[PDB]
Assembly symmetry: C2
């Protein structure tokens, strides 16, 4: 009873470009009864927002099978930490997930008044509007004993003008400023796997991605079939100089159909 | 003869107050014509600004002997790099030093037009007004071949409310985003030593500092007499596990007077 987990950007679509055959694949998985879920390290957007983006790319799926690092972070906090006030560095998606916890968020303004002193958890995701001030209060809070949580490790992600700094870039700065080892939630980390597992309890899991350092590393560390597609960031060549080795390489997710039909 | 190089914070003063005996010492060095300079890894301030801070404490010196990491960065660039436009992440101090190079600075507005591609050198120091946008263009430029230069390795520095992120933390974010090893100027790195060395040709150098991991490491790596004072960050106990060891430990810079006679 196989369940397939798909990374999004570079797998189900590429930027603002649709990848041919994705709708067919998804229509096929439903026909075969094959459960699936989308898993993105990006924490700037909600599952709902992602459902809309997917629709625009010719894909219709429930936001219920869309797992973002932000939602994984909320689930991790709820299950393994003690409720306390949160200071957030990140976008709308992440703020919304933290608000949902209902633990209470210390705003930048309250922080300026000294409330960083009462922060129990610091959550860091990709923040396009990052400022030194934010790094300052996050550092003060983490140094005061606040949990240091990072949504994902990605050093970078594509931007309009080229390769832009990712959450890992921001998390790295705080690691240096606090001298504290962050708890990273997303791929290729265990908290993310815990979330996938919770959704699909006893299934044989397959991971389909385009990044070796996150997607493939994730599959190998947790025993998921490591399937890499070539529609994204990685190439056959990157495989060799990488510690992570795909169990299967396909041109795109469309080819998953005949792969599944021929066993 | 002998030239004395002093780290500043934790040696000549603490935050806002001069350490006792520092005024006598400085006046003593001047009377004897003993060469000396002040060295700081901070690049947010101009040497002139430091002079004023020191004078208000009764510490009277020339701005020409106050070497900031920004000043050291300029001298390293002129000496070892080929002239090219610069993109700067840092405060007034560093911006001013980069201007003095006369190589041309790409501002955020120019970078917004796409001029980040014309950046030949990216210089990164402590920037209290850091923004993701700045990190973005610095990242793009470095990925486009621009030199990745960091003013100092300092992970943190003292702030009003506690320990704040230092230049090293900003440099770390860019190292991760670019996958490029930054060339670090400030102590214990060699570029800052090269600057001091060239300032006092023919002089035996003594380095006076309060940090084992930066000042003492700096002295031992480049052959300066490593003098540690106890008025700052490091303590005697810290020496045990420290990689580099001081040649001499003094309670403060004041106890230095008898040695010079
Ligand atoms: Mg991807
Ligand atoms: Mg010091």
């Amino acid at each position: 009873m196989v369940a397939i987990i798909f990374d999004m950007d570079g797998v189900l679509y590429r930027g603002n470009r649709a990848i041919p055959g994705v709708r067919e694949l998804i229509e096929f998985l439903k026909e075969r009864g094959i459960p699936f879920a989308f898993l993105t390290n990006n924490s700037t957007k909600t599952p709902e927002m992602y459902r809309e983006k997917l629709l625009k790319m010719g894909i219709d799926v429930s936001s219920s099978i869309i797992i973002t690092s932000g939602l994984a972070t909320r689930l991790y906090m709820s299950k393994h930490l003690d409720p306390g006030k949160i200071f957030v560095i990140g976008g709308e998606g992440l703020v919304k997930e933290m608000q949902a916890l209902g633990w209470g968020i210390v705003t930048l303004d309250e922080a300026r008044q000294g409330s960083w002193k009462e922060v129990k958890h610091v959550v860091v995701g990709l923040d396009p509007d990052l400022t030194y001030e934010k790094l300052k209060y996050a550092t003060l809070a983490i140094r005061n004993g606040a949990t240091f949580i990072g949504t994902n490790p990605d050093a970078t992600l594509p931007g309009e003008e080229g390769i832009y700094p990712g959450a890992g870039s921001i998390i790295a700065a705080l690691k240096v400023a606090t001298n504290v080892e962050p708890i990273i939630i997303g791929k290729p980390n265990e908290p993310m796997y815990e979330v996938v597992r919770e959704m699909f309890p006893g299934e044989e899991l397959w991971m389909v991605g385009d990044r070796l350092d996150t997607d493939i590393a994730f599959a190998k560390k947790f025993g998921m079939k490591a399937i890499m597609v070539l529609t994204g960031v990685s190439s056959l060549e990157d495989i060799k100089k990488s510690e992570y080795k795909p169990d299967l390489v396909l041109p795109s997710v469309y080819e998953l159909i005949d792969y599944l039909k021929t066993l």
